[PDB]
Design a protein around this ligand. Structure first.
Ligand code: ADP
Ligand code: ADP
Ligand code: MG
Ligand code: MG
Lengths: 228, 364, 364, 191
C-alpha cells in the first residue's frame, strides 16, 4: 500500500483442511511449524506423481493469506509465462513457494535467480521458503553447484501419495467442503473408470457436481455416465 | 525434391504481412515455412507458442517442395517489388532464389523438417461470430490484462462461452474488465485462458471483411479461421479467478455522470498527480463530485463537476490511470459508478447498455 | 508578484504549443516566462541556446506582472480544458493559480528575474521570404547535418545570402547537400551557421500561413518573425567549409535514371546489405546500372535496371542509406548522377531543376 | 595415519541417560538429523540447567560410537582456545556449538562462527547443533548477517525437568534421592 488489491479468490479447495494427512504426519507437523509466527525455515518436498506437492504449497499460501500475510507462489513449470525478474523483492514476503524446481535443470538463467533469491532471504529474516520437486536435492542435476548445496541445506521430506483407501475419503472430503455429497458407491466407481488419477479425479468432481447442480439430481452410479 | 512456384506480388503481400508480424528468440523462429502442395502455397510462422498459417492459390506452374526463409527479409523483398510483378521462387542448394524481372535475390535457408509443427489436437467448442463482435469483446477487456506476472493465469484473457453469449474477462489484481456479447447459436459451457500475445495476434488478424470468424476452442488450444488465415495458439494451463465473486455485492451508492466531462476532469487532475503512483481522490457529495490531486512539488489541482448522486458523502482515492482506461473503453454517453465505501472496489459501467462491466480497486 | 490576466482558451493553445516543444536540463529552463504588459501577454521559453517568444492580445482586465511556470503542466492544463473556456490566471504566494469554471490549478513557480534573457544584439542582414521557400531550403539539406561532432561547425546548417538568392548547405564529412532559392530583394553577401536544434525549431514554427517570414541575421544571432512568434537562436561560432571546393570538378560520366525506379532498386538491395555498414556496389555499363549487395549471412541481392549512360564502365561502392536519403530529398521525375572514378565523390541532382545538388562520398 | 589415542569422556551424558519429557518433539527432530547422510541445523535454547550441553555430548557420543568425526566447541571456555580452531570443521559429520550467547559482542569469534556456517553450507554432510540462552533473534550480535543465519533453521525451546522427573533422572544414572532435592549440575555430580 498504496494501493489496495482486488479480492481475487482462486480455487481455495486446496487447503490443509481438504488435504488428507496419511502418511505425511511428520511432514505436516513440521510444515505447520514453520508457518508459525514468527518462524523462518526452508523445507524441501519431493515426490513422484500426484502426491499433492502443489496442494501443500497452495495450502501454506492460503494459511498465511487468511491472516493477512503477504505470500508468493512461483510455478516453475509455467515459467514460460513470466521472467526470472519476478523473484526480485520476494525476500520481503512472509512465504515463498517454489513449485517444481526440477524444471530449471539446465536453465542457467533461472538457476542464478533462484540462487540469488535464496541468499536474499538468508541475509534477511522472516521469510518462509517451501520448495517442491521430483527428486531429492542431491539427485537434482543443477548447473550451479552452490545452489545444490543450498537446496540441500535444510529439512527434506518425501511426500507420500494417498493409498487407494485414503483416496476415496479424500474425494468425499471435497464434497462436504464444497457442499455436495459423494456417496461411497459413486466414489469407488470413479476410482475404477478414471483409473485412480487424482489430478483428474478432483477435476472431474466439478464436471459431475455442476451437471448435478443444474438438474438438480443426486449422485447415482448411472448419473455419472449420463453426465459423461 | 525441388520446390518451385510463381505467383503475383498482390497475392503474397497480405498473407505475408499476416504471418510475418512483431515476434529473438531462436534462429528458425524468425523464418517462414514455405511449402508447395498442388495446387496451393502455404506460409507458416510460429514462435514456439502460437502459429499462423496462410494459404495462397497457385494458378501458374509449380513443383512440390518445402523450405524456410527469413520472414522480415522475404517480406521486405516482396513488398519492395513493383506493383503487379510476378515472383519466381525456387530452391538452388542451401538457399532460396527469388526472381522478378531483372531483380534476383538469394536468401539463406534452414531445413523445413526442423520447423516446429503444432501437434493437431481434438477440437471441442466451435462457433462462428462476426469480426466486429470479437473485436468488441477484446477491446473492452484487453487493457486489464497483466504482463509477465507470477499469476500466469492473469497474463491473458478469459474466453468463456455460456449458452447464448460469449464473454471475455481480464484482470491484473488491481482492476477487472468483463464484456459479454451474444451469438446466434447455443454453445456448451466452456472457459479457456488465451495468452496475452494470443489476444494481440487474434485482434490484428481482424480486418474489414466481409468474412465471418470461425473459432475452434479445444482442450488446450484455440484456433480462429478468418478468410484464408488460420491462427492457432496454445492455452494458459491455469485456473482463472471468478469475476462474479469480484463484482461489488449490494452497493448502496450509485453515481451517473457524463462520460466525456468525467474523462476530461480526470485527465486534467492527472496532470498534477504523482508521476509514479498516479493518486487522485474523489469526494462524492450532494449532486457533486470533487476530484483533487497533488504531487511532491506541492502542486494541487481541483476539479468539481455536477453529477447525479444522492448517496452518503464519501472521499475515496483512485489510480487516475486505471479510471481513465475504463472511461476510454466506455465510448458512450453517460457512465454509472456503483460504490460501497472508501476501501472497497467500485463498479463502472455504461448507463445505457450493461454488456460490459469494470471494477477498479481504490487507494489508501 | 501581482500578475493577473484572463484570456480565452483558444488564444493560448497555439502560442503555448509553439513555446512547449522538444527542449533536462535545468530547473527554470523547463518553465515558461509569463509577463503581462498592458495590454499584451508574452510567453517565452528557452534553453540558454535559443529562445521563443509569443505575444497574446489581452482584451479582458489584467494587471502587470511576471512569473515562471512549468511548461508541459501549464500546456496540458489549458489543452485539457473544454473548448471555449476562459482561463483566469493570478499569483498567490510562491505559486500560480489557474481557474476555469469549477476547475482550480495551483502550480509551483520560480522567480521571473532568474529567467535567462538573450542580450539584444545588432541586426545586420534582414529580408522577408515566404514560408514555403524557407521550408524547401531546410528540407532539401537538413538530413545531411552531423550530430554532436568534434567538427562543431558541421552540427548545423549554413545559411548564406548572396545577391538575389538564399542558399543553405549541410554536410557531415561523408555527404553534402546544398539548396538555393531566390528572393525578391538584393541582399549583402553574408553566411552564418544555424545550429541543429535551431534548424529544427525554425522549420516546426512554419505553418500554412498566410504570413511571410521576416528573418534578421545578425553578427552572432539569428531571428525569425512569423505571425506573432519571434524565434531567436545563437549561431555556431565556426568556419563552415567551402562547398564549391567539394563539388566534383569536371566529371566525365553522366547517368540519368528514373528517380522512383532508382530509389526502389536501392531499397530492395539494401534489404540484403550489411546491417551496420550498409554497403552496396554500383556497376555502370552501356545503358545499364547493376546494383548488388550482400551480408555476412552470405545472402546476395542483385538489381539490374536500364538507365541512360554512355561513359566508361565502372564499379563503385556506396552507403545505401546516404544514396536513399538523396533520392528521398529529390521528389522529382528523373535524377542525374555525375561521377569521376570509383574512389571519388559523386554528385546527384534533379534532371529538371538545378536549384539543389547533393554530393556523396563512396566506399572501398 | 595417524591413529588417535583412545580417550573416553569422564561423564555420563548419553542419550540413554537423558529423560524425554517434556522435550519429546525436540528429541524426535534431534535424532532425525543425526541419521546419515543428510544434515541440517538445529538451535536449542533454555534458561539454566535444562540439558542443552547434555544433548550435545549425547549427539557427539551417538556418532562417535559409530565411527563418525565430531567436534564439540564450548564457547564458554573459549578463553582456552582460539577462533582458528573452527577451521576444517566443515569436514566433520557433526559440529556442536555450546553457549553461543557468550560471543555477543566478540567480533573475533562472531566472524569465525559466521565463516564456519557458510563453509558447511557450501559443502554437504555436516550436522550443526547450537545451544544458547535465548532465541537467535534475541542474540545481541554485531554481525546482522550471522543473526539471520542462526534464525535460519529449526529452533526448539528446551524444557527443564520437573522436580518429579528430576528424581527418577538421578536414579537412572545410578542404574547406568528426595533428600538431595535442586541444582541438577551438582545433583548428578553428587552421585
Ligand atoms: N492428501 C491429499 N488429500 C486431498 N487431495 C489430494 C491429496 N494429495 C493429492 N490430492 C489432490 O490430487 C491432485 C493432484 O495433485 P498434483 O498437482 O498432481 O500434485 P503434484 O504437484 O505433486 O504433481 C491435486 O489437485 C490435489 O487436490
Ligand atoms: N532430561 C534430562 N535427563 C537427565 N539428566 C538431565 C536432563 N537434563 C539435564 N540433566 C542433567 O543436567 C546436566 C546437564 O548439563 P547442563 O549444565 O544443565 O547443560 P546446560 O547448562 O546447557 O543446560 C547433566 O549432568 C544431566 O545429568
Ligand atoms: Mg503440480
Ligand atoms: Mg553446560
Amino acid at each position: 500500500p498504496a494501493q489496495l488489491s482486488l479480492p481475487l479468490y482462486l480455487p481455495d479447495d486446496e487447503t490443509f483442511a481438504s488435504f488428507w494427512p496419511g502418511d505425511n504426519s511428520s511432514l505436516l507437523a513440521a510444515l505447520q511449524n514453520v508457518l508459525r509466527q514468527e518462524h523462518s525455515g526452508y523445507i524441501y518436498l519431493w515426490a513422484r506423481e500426484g502426491a499433492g506437492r502443489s496442494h501443500l504449497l497452495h495450502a501454506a499460501c492460503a494459511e498465511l493469506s487468511q491472516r493477512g500475510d503477504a505470500v508468493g507462489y512461483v510455478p516453475l513449470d509455467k515459467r514460460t509465462w513470466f521472467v526470472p525478474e519476478v523473484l526480485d523483492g520476494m525476500e520481503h514476503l512472509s512465504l515463498v513457494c517454489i513449485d517444481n524446481i526440477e524444471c530449471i535443470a539446465g536453465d542457467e538463467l533461472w538457476e542464478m535467480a533462484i540462487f540469488d533469491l535464496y541468499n536474499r532471504i538468508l541475509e534477511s529474516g522472516k521469510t518462509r521458503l517451501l520448495i517442491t520437486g521430483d527428486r531429492p536435492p542431491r539427485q537434482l542435476n543443477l548447473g550451479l553447484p552452490d545452489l545444490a548445496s543450498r537446496l540441500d541445506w535444510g529439512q527434506i521430506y518425501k511426500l507420500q501419495p494417498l493409498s487407494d483407501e485414503d483416496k476415496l475419503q479424500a474425494l468425499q472430503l471435497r464434497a462436504r467442503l464444497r457442499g455436495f455429497e459423494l456417496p461411497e458407491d459413486v466414489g469407488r466407481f470413479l476410482l475404477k473408470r478414471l483409473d485412480r488419477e487424482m489430478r483428474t479425479l478432483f477435476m472431474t468432481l466439478d464436471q459431475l457436481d455442476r451437471a448435478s447442480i443444474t438438474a438438480q439430481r443426486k449422485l447415482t452410479i448411472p448419473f455419472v455416465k449420463e453426465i459423461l | 525434391s525441388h520446390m518451385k512456384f510463381t505467383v503475383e506480388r498482390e497475392h503474397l503481400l497480405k498473407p505475408l504481412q499476416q504471418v510475418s508480424g512483431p515476434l529473438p528468440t531462436l534462429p528458425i523462429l524468425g523464418n517462414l515455412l514455405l511449402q508447395v502442395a498442388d495446387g496451393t502455397l502455404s506460409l507458416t510462422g510460429t514462435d514456439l507458442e502460437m502459429e499462423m498459417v496462410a494459404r495462397v492459390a497457385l494458378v501458374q506452374p509449380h513443383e512440390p517442395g518445402a523450405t524456410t526463409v527469413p520472414a522480415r527479409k522475404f517480406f521486405d523483398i516482396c513488398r519492395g517489388l513493383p506493383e503487379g510483378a510476378e515472383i519466381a521462387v525456387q530452391l538452388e542448394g542451401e538457399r532460396m532464389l527469388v526472381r522478378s524481372g531483372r531483380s534476383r535475390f538469394s536468401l539463406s535457408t534452414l531445413p523445413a523438417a526442423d520447423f516446429p509443427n503444432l501437434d493437431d489436437w481434438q477440437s471441442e467448442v466451435e462457433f462462428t461470430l462476426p469480426q466486429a463482435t470479437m473485436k468488441r469483446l477484446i477491446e473492452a477487456t484487453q487493457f486489464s490484462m497483466a504482463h509477465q506476472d507470477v499469476r500466469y493465469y492473469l497474463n491473458g484473457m478469459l474466453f468463456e462461452t455460456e449458452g447464448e453469449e460469449l464473454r471475455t474477462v481480464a484482470t491484473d489484481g488491481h482492476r477487472l474488465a468483463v464484456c459479454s456479447m451474444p451469438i446466434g447459436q447455443s454453445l456448451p459451457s466452456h472457459s479457456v485462458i488465451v495468452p496475452r500475445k494470443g489476444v494481440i495476434e487474434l485482434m490484428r488478424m481482424l480486418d474489414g471483411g466481409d468474412n465471418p470468424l470461425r473459432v475452434q476452442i479445444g482442450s488446450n488450444n484455440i484456433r480462429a479461421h478468418v478468410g484464408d488465415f488460420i491462427f492457432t495458439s496454445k492455452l494458459v494451463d491455469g485456473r482463472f479467478p471468478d469475476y462474479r465473486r469480484v463484482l461489488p455485492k449490494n452497493p448502496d451508492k450509485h453515481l451517473e455522470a457524463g462520460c466525456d466531462l468525467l474523462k476530461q476532469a480526470f485527465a486534467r487532475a492527472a496532470i498534477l498527480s504523482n508521476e509514479k503512483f498516479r493518486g487522485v481522490r474523489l469526494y462524492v457529495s450532494e449532486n457533486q463530485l470533487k476530484i483533487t490531486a497533488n504531487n511532491p512539488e506541492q502542486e494541487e489541482a481541483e476539479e468539481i463537476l455536477d453529477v447525479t448522486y444522492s448517496g452518503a458523502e464519501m472521499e475515496i482515492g483512485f489510480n487516475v490511470s486505471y479510471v481513465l482506461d475504463v472511461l476510454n473503453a466506455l465510448k458512450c454517453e453517460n457512465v454509472r459508478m456503483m460504490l460501497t465505501d472508501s476501501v472497497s472496489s467500485v463498479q463502472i459501467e455504461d448507463a445505457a447498455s450493461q454488456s460490459a462491466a469494470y471494477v477498479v480497486m481504490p487507494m489508501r
